[PDB]
Assembly symmetry: C3
Homo-oligomer: 114 residues x 3
């Protein structure tokens, strides 16, 4: 799976260890081995949410399965909780888009997961 967070919070406000915390928390939440979790954090972005440039985040989670109504509610509480605690972003200033990928549409290691 792949998790991306884009935020206007400055880089120095991203704690050391945040990428590893995302990796391990998402490995547990998706049930997949951590070796398959990729995480990407993009701070210092020029962004606005509802017109305001207070701290906000736009995120995505792509996974081959493990995506659905109840699962995404659970991921949203987990991820909003992490963004609030670690980056000080209010949960009502976060959007997370969830993508259930077909294995044939995810390339890796010269091939795909199909």
């Amino acid at each position: 799976p792949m998790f991306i967070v884009n935020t206007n919070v400055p880089r120095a406000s991203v704690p050391d260890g945040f990428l590893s915390e995302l990796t391990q928390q998402l490995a547990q939440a998706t049930g997949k081995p951590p070796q398959y979790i990729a995480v990407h954090v993009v701070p210092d972005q020029l962004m606005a949410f509802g017109g305001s440039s207070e701290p906000c985040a736009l995120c995505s989670l792509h996974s081959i399965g493990k995506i659905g109504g109840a699962q995404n509610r659970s991921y949203s509480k987990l991820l909003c909780g992490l963004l609030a605690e670690r980056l000080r972003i209010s949960p009502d200033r976060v959007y997370i888009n969830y993508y259930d990928m077909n294995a044939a549409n995810v390339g890796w290691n010269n091939s795909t997961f199909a």
Copy 2:
């Protein structure tokens, strides 16, 4: 909804008020309150369109509904017009990908919209 524009135009060429203009114009275009609109502009990118690194843009619009044939043509005219007027990017050097998100796949405020 969420609108992202990635461009090779330099940061200093992005006018004051650009995020705000996008927020209110996308609010009008989607018919949604400005408080729902998130916008993200990424200047100074290493990008090419047709092999040329003249000014160009790669963009996305994600919305729960309000995405379709005629609607997307109207969004493209609006957004290309803004990129041309404000960033001086030719419309034939802009791509915008449109995504009609299911409410269950959009997380916000510790939950989703399902």
Copy 3:
């Protein structure tokens, strides 16, 4: 079509000619004219793959058609090969998400391709 590569490799390690090579190889691979191929490379990113910050890449290819099981295996071999040769990223530290876009959902030049 559009191809985006996000990587933690530093900008100085992206060789001259890289965007052009991507443009030309993707035109050839997809069968589409090079004038319509857009490419975007994002170095210096804060990213991990499997929990490690060794060089890695997260990429996407969006195309109106020319996406499918065998085609995507072929694109992955091509694109991982380029990333290994030019950016010195191991193919097993690359993900590429593939998107078969409907023409109505790709904006360009004040309209869409529908």
